[PDB]
Design an enzyme around this catalytic site. Structure first.
Site, PDB file in Angstrom:
ATOM      1  N   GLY A  16       7.121   2.333  -6.508  1.00  0.00           N
ATOM      2  CA  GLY A  16       6.196   2.233  -5.041  1.00  0.00           C
ATOM      3  C   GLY A  16       7.339   2.673  -3.785  1.00  0.00           C
ATOM      4  N   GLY A  18       7.068   3.211   0.646  1.00  0.00           N
ATOM      5  CA  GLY A  18       6.520   3.084   2.420  1.00  0.00           C
ATOM      6  C   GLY A  18       7.497   4.145   2.908  1.00  0.00           C
ATOM      7  CG  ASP A 131      -0.618  -2.202   5.591  1.00  0.00           C
ATOM      8  OD1 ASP A 131      -1.296  -0.940   5.792  1.00  0.00           O
ATOM      9  OD2 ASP A 131      -0.329  -1.805   5.018  1.00  0.00           O
TER      10      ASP A 131
HETATM   11  O1  LIG Z   1       4.723  -2.491  -2.927  1.00  0.00           O
HETATM   12  C1  LIG Z   1       4.478  -2.248  -2.896  1.00  0.00           C
HETATM   13  N1  LIG Z   1       3.343  -0.737  -2.476  1.00  0.00           N
HETATM   14  C2  LIG Z   1       2.757  -1.109  -4.386  1.00  0.00           C
HETATM   15  C3  LIG Z   1       3.283  -0.482  -5.495  1.00  0.00           C
HETATM   16  C4  LIG Z   1       4.730  -1.461  -5.672  1.00  0.00           C
HETATM   17  N2  LIG Z   1       4.720  -2.703  -5.982  1.00  0.00           N
HETATM   18  C5  LIG Z   1       4.708  -3.120  -6.845  1.00  0.00           C
HETATM   19  N3  LIG Z   1       4.916  -2.482  -8.460  1.00  0.00           N
HETATM   20  C6  LIG Z   1       4.156  -3.532  -9.015  1.00  0.00           C
HETATM   21  N4  LIG Z   1       3.686  -2.838 -10.383  1.00  0.00           N
HETATM   22  C7  LIG Z   1       3.988  -1.443 -10.637  1.00  0.00           C
HETATM   23  C8  LIG Z   1       4.007  -0.777 -10.079  1.00  0.00           C
HETATM   24  C9  LIG Z   1       2.968   0.624 -10.000  1.00  0.00           C
HETATM   25  C10 LIG Z   1       3.578   1.120 -11.452  1.00  0.00           C
HETATM   26  C11 LIG Z   1       3.464   0.496 -12.469  1.00  0.00           C
HETATM   27  C12 LIG Z   1       3.380   0.664 -13.887  1.00  0.00           C
HETATM   28  N5  LIG Z   1       2.283   0.712 -14.898  1.00  0.00           N
HETATM   29  C13 LIG Z   1       2.541   2.022 -15.930  1.00  0.00           C
HETATM   30  C14 LIG Z   1       1.275   1.469 -16.535  1.00  0.00           C
HETATM   31  O2  LIG Z   1      -0.063   1.956 -16.154  1.00  0.00           O
HETATM   32  C15 LIG Z   1      -0.143   1.471 -15.000  1.00  0.00           C
HETATM   33  C16 LIG Z   1       1.199   1.522 -13.857  1.00  0.00           C
HETATM   34  C17 LIG Z   1       3.490  -0.673 -11.893  1.00  0.00           C
HETATM   35  N6  LIG Z   1       4.008  -4.898  -9.300  1.00  0.00           N
HETATM   36  C18 LIG Z   1       5.142  -5.270  -7.844  1.00  0.00           C
HETATM   37  C19 LIG Z   1       4.756  -4.367  -7.014  1.00  0.00           C
HETATM   38  C20 LIG Z   1       5.554  -5.320  -5.148  1.00  0.00           C
HETATM   39  C21 LIG Z   1       6.133  -5.399  -4.659  1.00  0.00           C
HETATM   40  C22 LIG Z   1       5.444  -6.453  -5.357  1.00  0.00           C
HETATM   41  C23 LIG Z   1       4.483  -1.120  -1.026  1.00  0.00           C
HETATM   42  C24 LIG Z   1       5.338   0.564  -1.375  1.00  0.00           C
HETATM   43  C25 LIG Z   1       6.817  -0.402  -0.039  1.00  0.00           C
HETATM   44  C26 LIG Z   1       6.137  -1.451  -0.399  1.00  0.00           C
HETATM   45 MG   LIG Z   2       1.084  -6.918   5.647  1.00  0.00          MG
END
Ligand SMILES: O=C(NCCCNc1nc(Nc2cccc(CN3CCOCC3)c2)ncc1C1CC1)C1CCC1
Ligand SMILES: [Mg+2]
Ligand SMILES: [Mg+2]
Length: 269
Positions: A16, A18, A131
């Site tokens: 992820g 931003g 947000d």
């Molecule tokens: O946190 C943010 N956006 C949410 C997506 C990235 N963050 C996370 N992603 C994830 N997991 C995630 C994100 C994208 C893809 C996937 C994997 N999967 C693969 C199979 O099908 C579904 C997605 C898992 N877990 C936790 C987190 C947050 C920080 C604690 C923002 C981007 C700047 C802050």
């Molecule tokens: Mg916030």
């Protein structure tokens, strides 16, 4: 493979981004099967990124809830900042909706019950998120709708707001901002309820309740329309209709309040 405390991650595994953060998949250096998300500065906005990650640590370290992404560790120094958070294996709601196009009312109910649980804590602690949007709502599978756990994430704009005070900082995502926010007026914790109404409407219909071609266009639309009434599809259940009309009210004094939201019949199991 970089390290932060007893955790590691790789900058190849961006999950992820931003304007003010990037997130990488990682894991515990000892229990390799414990996965984490490591949030780092975005160097295209170094100083603000650093500030916001710092703020997020201060908030998230006070919030422990199954429907808020856990902060396992962090490391803050003069010139660098990392957060080590819970990894949610289902990714964000935005990508889920993009695939599914729309969600059933039963699944909306299950998701919103959890969002409401998280909001109960924020409201009791006197914290506003500011947000809320599908990009910041995460899913985790332990299987079916009834087993998906949802967690609110991205507390970099969150602040304490004393119950007799109003906030005025312009922040958030314009398509999800309450009208009072985007019109540069004072606001309170009911601004988050507008955002939540917007998310729910988007889950139901696949679209925004108030279409606009830009942020400035949306603001002009809110300024010019003193009453805001979203279109509700005819298939919508009567409780979900009422809830959406209650959350998506233009004027914060009229908008559904927290007690009404938490107890709304749509959320009954
Ligand atoms: O946190 C943010 N956006 C949410 C997506 C990235 N963050 C996370 N992603 C994830 N997991 C995630 C994100 C994208 C893809 C996937 C994997 N999967 C693969 C199979 O099908 C579904 C997605 C898992 N877990 C936790 C987190 C947050 C920080 C604690 C923002 C981007 C700047 C802050
Ligand atoms: Mg916030
Ligand atoms: Mg308000």
């Amino acid at each position: 493979t970089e390290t932060v405390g007893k955790f590691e991650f790789s900058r190849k595994d961006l999950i992820g981004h931003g304007a003010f953060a990037v997130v990488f998949k990682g894991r515990h250096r000892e229990k390799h099967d414990l996965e984490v998300a490591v949030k780092c500065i975005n160097k295209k906005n170094l100083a603000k990124s650093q500030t916001l990650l710092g703020k997020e640590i201060k908030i998230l370290k006070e919030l422990k809830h199954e429907n808020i992404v856990a902060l396992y560790d962090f490391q803050e120094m003069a010139n660098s900042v990392y957060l080590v958070m819970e990894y949610c294996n289902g990714g964000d709601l935005a990508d889920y909706l993009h695939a599914m196009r729309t969600l059933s009312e039963d699944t909306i109910r299950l998701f919103l019950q959890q969002i409401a649980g998280a909001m109960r804590l924020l409201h009791s602690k006197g914290i506003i998120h500011r947000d809320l949007k599908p990009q910041n709502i995460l899913l985790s599978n332990p299987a079916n709708p009834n087993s998906i756990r949802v967690k609110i994430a991205d507390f970099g704009f969150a602040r304490y707001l004393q119950s007799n005070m109003m906030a005025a900082t312009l922040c958030g995502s314009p398509m999800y901002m309450a009208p009072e926010v985007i019109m540069s007026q004072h606001y309170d914790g009911k601004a988050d309820l507008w955002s939540i109404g917007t998310i729910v409407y988007q889950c139901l219909t696949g679209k925004a309740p108030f279409q606009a071609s830009s942020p400035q266009d949306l603001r002009l639309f809110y300024e010019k329309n003193k009453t805001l009434v979203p279109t509700i599809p005819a298939a919508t259940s009567a409780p979900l209709r009422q809830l959406l009309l209650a959350l998506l009210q233009r004027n914060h004094k009229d908008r559904m309040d927290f007690d009404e939201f938490f107890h709304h019949p749509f959320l009954d199991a």
